[PDB]
Amino acid sequence: PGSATVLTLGAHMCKWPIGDPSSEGFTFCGRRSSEGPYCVEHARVAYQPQQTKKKSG
Amino acid sequence: DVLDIDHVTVGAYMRNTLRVDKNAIREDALFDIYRVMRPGEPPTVEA
Numbered sequence: 532p533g534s535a536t537v538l539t540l541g542a543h544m545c546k547w548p549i550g551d552p553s554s555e556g557f558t559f560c561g562r563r564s565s566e567g568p569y570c571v572e573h574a575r576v577a578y579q580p581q582q583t584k585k586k587s588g
Numbered sequence: 589d590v591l592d593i594d595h596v597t598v599g600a601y602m603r604n605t606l607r608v609d610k611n612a613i614r615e616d617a618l619f620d621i622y623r624v625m626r627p628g629e630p631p632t633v634e635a
């Protein structure tokens with residue numbers, strides 16, 4: 532569970548959903564997560580870990 | 589062992605070229621070559 536609902540979501544806050552939106556309790560983390568939609572604890576699990584990609588140009 | 593370069597038979601053209609370039613590491617030369625080939629693109633060591 533988080534510490535902020537879908538209404539009290541301000542700028543520079545975590546937005547990783549927890550639970551089911553069609554459920555009773557559905558909130559977000561709501562922590563210090565500036566310069567990014569998700570938090571630092573979930574930024575490494577959401578995006579592709581170990582980014583290794585390259586091509587020609 | 590210092591050098592063998594006179595001014596009558598051999599020239600210092602190859603040695604002088606090492607003082608005009610600012611690239612030292614191989615990655616620097618690779619990035620410069622990639623920028624010269626594909627201009628206007630962020631070069632990476634992998635590509």
Ligand SMILES: [Zn+2]
Pocket residue numbers: 545546547560561569570572573
């Ligand atoms: Zn989160």
